Design a protein around this motif. Sequence first.
Motif, short mmCIF file in Angstrom:
data_model
loop_
_atom_site.label_atom_id
_atom_site.label_comp_id
_atom_site.label_asym_id
_atom_site.label_seq_id
_atom_site.Cartn_x
_atom_site.Cartn_y
_atom_site.Cartn_z
N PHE C 70 0.85 -1.19 0.00
CA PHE C 70 0.00 0.00 0.00
C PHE C 70 0.88 1.24 0.00
N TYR C 71 0.42 2.30 -0.67
CA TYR C 71 0.92 3.66 -0.48
C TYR C 71 2.45 3.74 -0.46
N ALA G 17 -14.69 6.32 10.82
CA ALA G 17 -13.29 6.65 11.08
C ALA G 17 -12.88 7.95 10.40
N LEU G 40 -33.05 6.20 5.99
CA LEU G 40 -33.79 7.46 6.07
C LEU G 40 -32.95 8.67 5.68
N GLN G 42 -30.18 9.71 6.05
CA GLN G 42 -29.21 10.21 7.02
C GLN G 42 -27.98 9.32 7.09
N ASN G 71 -17.00 -6.53 2.84
CA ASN G 71 -15.90 -7.45 3.08
C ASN G 71 -16.32 -8.51 4.09
N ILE G 93 -16.02 -1.17 -0.49
CA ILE G 93 -14.87 -1.98 -0.10
C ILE G 93 -15.38 -3.41 0.02
N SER G 118 -11.75 -1.39 -3.25
CA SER G 118 -10.97 -2.52 -2.73
C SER G 118 -11.76 -3.80 -3.00
N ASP G 145 -6.06 -0.61 -4.53
CA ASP G 145 -5.16 -1.44 -3.73
C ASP G 145 -4.30 -0.59 -2.78
N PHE G 146 -4.87 0.55 -2.37
CA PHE G 146 -4.27 1.43 -1.36
C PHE G 146 -2.93 2.00 -1.83
N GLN G 147 -2.79 2.18 -3.14
CA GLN G 147 -1.68 2.91 -3.73
C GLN G 147 -2.20 3.53 -5.02
N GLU H 78 -34.50 14.53 10.50
CA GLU H 78 -33.98 13.76 9.38
C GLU H 78 -33.29 12.47 9.80
#
Lengths: 434, 73, 167, 80, 106, 83, 162, 82
Positions: C70-71, G17, G40, G42, G71, G93, G118, G145-147, H78
Motif C-alpha cells: 500500500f501507499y 473513522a 432514512l 441520514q 468485506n 470496499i 478494494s 489497492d491502497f496505492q 432527518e
Amino acid sequence: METILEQQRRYHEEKERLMDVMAKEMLTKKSTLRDQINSDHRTRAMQDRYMEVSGNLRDLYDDKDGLRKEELNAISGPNEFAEFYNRLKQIKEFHRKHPNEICVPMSVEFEELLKARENPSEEAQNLVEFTDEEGYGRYLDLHDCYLKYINLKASEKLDYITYLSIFDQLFDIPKERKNAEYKRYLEMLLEYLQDYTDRVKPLQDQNELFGKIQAEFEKKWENGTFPGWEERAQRLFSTKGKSLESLDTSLFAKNPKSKGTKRDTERNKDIAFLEAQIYEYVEILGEQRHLTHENVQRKQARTGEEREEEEEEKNLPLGWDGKPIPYWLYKLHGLNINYNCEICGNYTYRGPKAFQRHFAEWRHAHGMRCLGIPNTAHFANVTQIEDAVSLWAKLKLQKASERWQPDTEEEYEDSSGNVVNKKTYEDLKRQGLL
Amino acid sequence: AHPPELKKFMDKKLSLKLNGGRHVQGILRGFDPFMNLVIDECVEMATSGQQNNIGMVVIRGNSIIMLEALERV
Amino acid sequence: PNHTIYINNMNDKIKKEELKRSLYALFSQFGHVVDIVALKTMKMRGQAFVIFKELGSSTNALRQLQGFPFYGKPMRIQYAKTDSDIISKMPNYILFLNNLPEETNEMMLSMLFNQFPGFKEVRLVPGRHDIAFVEFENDGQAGAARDALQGFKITPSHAMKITYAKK
Amino acid sequence: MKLVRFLMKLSHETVTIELKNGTQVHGTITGVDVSMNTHLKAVKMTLKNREPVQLETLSIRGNNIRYFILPDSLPLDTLL
Amino acid sequence: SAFDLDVVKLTAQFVARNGRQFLTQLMQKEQRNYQFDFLRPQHSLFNYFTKLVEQYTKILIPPKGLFSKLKKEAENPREVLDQVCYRVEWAKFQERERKKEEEEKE
Amino acid sequence: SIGVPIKVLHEAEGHIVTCETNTGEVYRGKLIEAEDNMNCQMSNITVTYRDGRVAQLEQVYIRGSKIRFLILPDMLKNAPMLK
Amino acid sequence: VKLTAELIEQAAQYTNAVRDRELDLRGYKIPVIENLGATLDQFDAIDFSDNEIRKLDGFPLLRRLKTLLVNNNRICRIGEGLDQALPCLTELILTNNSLVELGDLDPLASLKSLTYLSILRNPVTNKKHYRLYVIYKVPQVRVLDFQKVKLKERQEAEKMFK
Amino acid sequence: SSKMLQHIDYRMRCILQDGRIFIGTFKAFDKHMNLILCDCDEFRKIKPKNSKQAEREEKRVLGLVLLRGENLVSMTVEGPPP
RNA sequence: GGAUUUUUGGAGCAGGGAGAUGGAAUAGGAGCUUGCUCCGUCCACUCCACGCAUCGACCUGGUAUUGCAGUACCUCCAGGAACGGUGC
C-alpha cells in the motif's frame, strides 16, 4: 434446468398459492374500512402476482416448442436417468429437512397476526392512500382544488354553495372561465380525484377501464355523443358550434380547426383531457361527492364538542355497616394524614397502622421483589428506593463479610513451602501439578 | 445587563472588521454595556487598500463582527 | 498486545484523510473501525493508528497484514504499546505461564488471561520465581489464547508463552 | 393586545405560511407560543425556486416568517 | 431433505414421460442395478410422488405450459375475482356439507 | 431565563473551538472569553473570512450576533445540559 | 436466517473513522440484502461485517452513499444496477471476497464516481493483467489497492486488448 | 409549551440563516432557542453557475455546534435517535 | 421585554459585451398550420478582459522523512485549472 417443465412448476405453485390467497381474501374479510380499501388493492395485487406468473407462463414457448420434440422420444430412459441419478448420488449426507421447497406460498399470500399480510405484506396497507379526514374511502380531497380555485378566482362570495355546485355537476355552463387556466386546474383536481378513484376501485381491471376510457376519449365525445335539435352539435371542450353534424365534423379538420386557433383540437388537448377526466370522475362519484358534501355540512354546522372529537375520531371512611364515620372518631383515627409509599407504585395511604401493616401487605411485597431486594424486615419503613438500594447495599456487604467462604479463607500450602488458598490449590492441583 | 470584557484589551491596538466589509484600525478607548468600542487613532480600511485616519471613531457594535489584536496587553 | 493497532511504513506524499479512507476500507474487514488517530506532524510522519474493537482483531490485522502492499511501501501493522483514548475512557483448561514476570501487575495479567472467554483465575507461583498457572472457566478459551500467546509479548523484555499443563 | 394572540388561535388549524427564505408552505402546525413560534407538521414547503419538500414534524420560527394564511372556516373577530 | 426431494422430482419427471401403463422410463430404474426407494406404493412417499405427478400433469396439460398459454391470468384480475368467488362458493357448499354430516352422524 | 445554550458556550470557551460568522468569517481557535451575549474573544485563531486564505491571527473579537454557529468540544457530548 | 430492518435500524449509524455517517451491522452473517432504505437519507455508509451475501446485489436507492463494507462476505459476482443507486459512491470496499473472473467486472465501469475501491483477497488478484483490466475499466479511480493509480498503468490498460 | 422538547436527541435537519440544512442530533432549546447540535454536520448548494453542470452539496461536519439564536429557519427531523 | 449581540428581519434583485455559430423533439407571437422572416428566457465551442487576484483541497511525475499520538490543515518543484467563497 427444467424450463418447459420446471418453469411450469414454478408457475403452477405461484398461481395456486395466488388462487388460495385470493379465495380466502375474497371470502373472509375484516371490519376496518382503510383495511377494506387496502384489501381490495391486495386482492387486485394477488391477481397481479398470478399476473406475473401468467406473464411468464403464457408466452413461455421458447422452451416448450423446442424441448417437446427432444423430450418427445420413446426410446431412451435409464441412460439419461442414470446420468442425472449418478450426479444426484453425491454426498447428500447432510441430515436435515427442508419445508422451504413447498412451504413458501402460504407465507407469501396468507394473513399475518397484527396486519393480515403475507411475505409481500410487510408494507401492505392504505398507508399513504388515506389522509386525515378522508377515511380510506369515506371523505376525499376537495379542499386542495377548492384552495386552487380560491386563489384563481378571488371572489368575496366564493363560498360553500358555489364550491359544491361547481364540484357536483358534470358539464353545466361553468362558474368560471374554462377558456383560461381554470380548465387545467380542474384537470389537476381531477387527477387527484382520479387517483383517489383508482385506489377506491382496486379490484376492477385498471388497464381495461383505461382502454374503455381511451375509446371514450377517442370516439364518444367527438363522434356525436351529445345530440341536439348552433344546436345540432357544439363542443364544451372546443367552444365551437355546428350548423349540423357535418358542419361540426368539417370545422374539425378545416383550416381554423387545424392550427388557426390556440384552442384547436390539439391546442386544447391537455385542457380537454382535464375536462373529460373531471366530468367522468364527478359523474361517477355523484354519490361520493354527495356523501362528502353531507359530511361537510355536518362539519360546518355541527357543535364544537362533537365536531372536534369526531375529527379526532364528604370522603367519610367506611364502617362495617358502610356509613360515614362520625367526626370526633375520624379525628381520632387521623385519616387526614397520607403516607407516600414510593415502593408501592407511589401508592399513598391514609391511617397510620394501615400504612405500617402495608409494609408486609402484598403491594409492598411485590414492590420489593421487583426492586430486586427481599421483603425482609430490615428495610420496612424505608420507602424511597435509592435509600433502599444503598441500605441493602451495605447489608449485602455485611452478609458477605460474616459469611465464612472457604474459597478465600480456607488456605493451602503447596509442597514447596509456600501457601495459596483452597481455590488456587485445587486449580493448579487438577490442572496438572499438585 | 453585563458590560463586555475588553478590560485588558483597553488602550491597546485592534484591527476590526465592521459591516460593509470595512476595517477600523485603532486603539480600544471607550465602550458601554452596548459594546460600542470607540477607537481613537482609528483609521478606515476600504475594499481597496485606501485608508484614511478618522481621528476618533466611536464604532458601534451594531455592525462590527470582528476585531483582532496587535499585541498581548 | 493492544486493540489500538499501529499501522505505518507507507508514503508521506499521501494525505492523512486519503490514507484514512484507504485504512477504513482495508480495516473494516480485519477488525472494527472506532477511530483513526493520524498525525502528520514531523515527529511521527508516515504513520497512524487504528483503534479496533478487539485486541485480537488488532493483532490479527497485524499478523495478516504483516507487510501488506500500500501507499508507496508495504505497510506494516502491529499491536501498540498501549491503547487509544476511546477504549481508555471505556490444549487444556489450566496452563503454566513460563517466562512469567516476577514484575507483572496482577490486574494486567488478569486482563490478559481474560482476553479469552472468562478465565477461572491466574496463580503466579510465589515460591521459586518465574512461573505461573492460569485456569480458564472455558477450556477452549484457555487453549485458544494460550496457543496465540505462545511467544506472546507482555512487557516486551520477554515472551510469555503458555502451553497445556502436563499430566 | 396583539395579533400574536390572534395567531395563538391556531391548533388543528389548516394554515399556509410564507416564510423568510422565499418560503411558501401548507401546514397544520403543531403548537404556537407567544413569540409566533409555530412548529409545522405534515407540511409541504417550497422556498425560493424549490420543490414540495415534506416535513412531518418541523419547527417554523417567528421573525423568520413573513405571511400567514388562516383557515377559510375561521371567524376572524372570534379569532382575535 | 433436498436430496430426497430431488429424487421425488426425478420420479415426477419419469411419471410425466411414462407413456404406457407397463412401459415407461422408471421400469428400467426399478430393477436396473440402482436403488429405487420411491418406487413403492406402500411407502408413504408414494403419496408425495402422486402429488408431484399431479404437479407434472398440471405442467403437461397443453393449457398448462406445453405450447399454449392464456393471459386471463397474467393480465386478468376480473377472472381472478370470478375465481375467488368460485372458491368461496365451493367453501360455502362445503361448510353446509360438514354441518349436515355432523348433524346426521350425531 | 438562563440558557443551557450559555452553559454550552461556557463549556466551549477556553479551548480550540471554531466559530462561523455571517459573511463567512469563520475563526477556528481558542475561543477564550465568551460572554452570554456571545461576543466571543478567540485566541490564536485561523479565520477564513470565507476567503479561502484562512489566515491565523491572535486574540480576535468575533461578535456572536453574526455567529452562524460554533463547533465546540467534541468531548462534552455527555453534557450536563442534555445528559 | 432472516436479515430484516430490525438489524438495519438497530445498526449503528454514526461517526465513522473518516468522520462520515456509517451504519455497521457486524455479527449477523446476514445473507439477505433487503429492507435498507430505512436508513432514512441520514446515512452514507452501509457496513455488513460478518456477512454471507451470496453476491454483490440488493441495495436500495441511495443517492448519498459514501462508504459500504461488503468485506468478509460471500461475494461471488457483481450486480448491475449499482450506479443509479450509488451515484455519490466512491468507497465500495469488497475485500476478503470471492470474485473470480473479469466477467465479474462488467458493471464495475458504469459508475462515474468510483475512486476509492478494494476487492482484495479475490482470485481475480494474482491473475495476469488483472490490475490492467481494472485500470482500463475504472477511469475516475484514484485509490486502487491502497496505492495511487498511474498514467502509465492507464496507457497500458487502454492500449492492450484491442 | 416546548414543542421540540419531544423531538430532540434525534438527528434533526436544522435550517440556516442562508438556506443550508444541518442534521445534528439536537439537544435543547432556550428563550432565544440557540441550538446545541451534537454529532452535527452541514450541507449547502454547490452552485454550478450553469445548467449543463448540475447542482450538488459538499459535506461539512462541525460535530457539536452551538448555533447562535439568529440561525433557525426551521427544525425538522432527518434521523431517528441513535 | 419590536432600538448597537440572536425571535417583529438589510430583504429583495440582476449575472460583463458579440460573431451569416447552434439545440427547444412534447411548449412561445405575428405574418392567419407545413416552408420561411424577425422577436422579448440558457448552455457547448471561439474573440475580448479563459469575468479579474488570493488561498485551500486534489490529478501529474520527481522529490525528504521510519517516525509514537490524539488533528483547523502539515514536504519541496513544476503544470493545469475539474471545485469553494473573499475584494471589483
